[PDB]
Amino acid sequence: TWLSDFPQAWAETGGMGLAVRQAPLIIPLKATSTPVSIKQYPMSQEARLGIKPHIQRLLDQGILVPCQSPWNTPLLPYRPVQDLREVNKRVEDIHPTVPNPYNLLSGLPPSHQWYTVLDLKDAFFCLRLHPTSQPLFAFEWRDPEMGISGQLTWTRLPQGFKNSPTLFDEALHRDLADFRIQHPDLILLQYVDDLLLAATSELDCQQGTRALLQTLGNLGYRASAKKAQICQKQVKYLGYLLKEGQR
């Protein structure tokens, strides 16, 4: 099966990802920015107990670490959501290079009607943050019944950060550049963590999907085995139904 042949490529069997070829990202600030420290709004016990196992898993994975930072933004009430709006305002803008899906799909021709669709799991967390940029994303974490109050921050590209989709898309494009060169017959559409491979034949789509999974796993990315649509003639991609070259 596909699950057995590519254990490294699937999130189910490959462990948390880590894009080993990508340098840790430095996040430039705007020219006039200084740190902003926003007080953590008090959180109910119900919310805290709901968030806690998530925080602990991230700590165990090294995705969160303790820190002392002049930056602080609040966590909101369950899985944790950080309000990074005041950090986002202080970070230098980058050009938005992620194509809109309508335009991305224009590049899909009718000669290629066999499709594989993969979505990468925990995509942003596969990209490391440079230690100089980690303090930007700090938040407070209290455990009233263990006696630890202090800050944590992210060692990977965080959710809620305005440049994460663009930085991830650019990184994955660098990492898949050689795959494209080695498989010029195939069409590969990338939309952040949502990937479509298109081929002429069921076989060429199988061999290409095998190459792509091998490549993704080797690079440190992980795809959802549960959601994968492998070597079909009909797939859902980016909210479209792809059938008969339509849509």
Next chain:
Amino acid sequence: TWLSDFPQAWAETGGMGLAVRQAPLIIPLKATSTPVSIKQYPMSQEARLGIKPHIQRLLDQGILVPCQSPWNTPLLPYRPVQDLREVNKRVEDIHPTVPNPYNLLSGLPPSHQWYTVLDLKDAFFCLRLHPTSQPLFAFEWRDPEMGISGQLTWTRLPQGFKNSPTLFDEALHRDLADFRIQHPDLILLQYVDDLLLAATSELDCQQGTRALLQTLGNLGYRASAKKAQICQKQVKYLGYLLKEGQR
């Protein structure tokens, strides 16, 4: 004085006006209009007693007459104000030929710095309405303590009617056409019932004003002696102060 020399021209001494050269006006309706009869809102005694002497004076003057009409619009609460909006909607539009005052004043040159300003009193009432058009403007009048309920209507161009300013301005232009031809040295600006005469010299402004008053009174119009600004170098006209050729 000016009051003594031109008794016919002034409202104070000449009686109510009546533009004797102007045919009674016929008011064309829109192609699809039919009569509208709006019920008179009950009026308080205080309002009725306030309006009554005005109605009686207009009846005495023949400006109001009794009628039976399929049209009816309400009087509002003191001097009477008729709500003619539903009649206005059913009357055919005419081109708006009254110039805006800014443009009207552009036609005043600096060579003419002696001014006379007259305003005509009860201007619209000087124009007769054709009997076929009189029923359009009917309203109800009750006297609870004399026992008369029935309609009245106007025999003259009414207040509140959307075409009155334009029809009056056009009529007065016809009536003053010959004056302009006989006095080509003078500037005469007309804005509905507000008239400015401009001359080169105090004398020429006096002789022109004498001619204009004689002409206006003869035609049946009446000017306010109280408000007249006669042969001055400074006047207020149409909300401007005219001084030194300025404004």
Next chain:
DNA sequence: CTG
């Protein structure tokens, strides 16, 4: 009265 019905920005």
Next chain:
DNA sequence: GGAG
């Protein structure tokens, strides 16, 4: 959601 001051006009007549």
Next chain:
DNA sequence: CTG
């Protein structure tokens, strides 16, 4: 939590 801050048309």
Next chain:
DNA sequence: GGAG
């Protein structure tokens, strides 16, 4: 007068 739904965003993070």
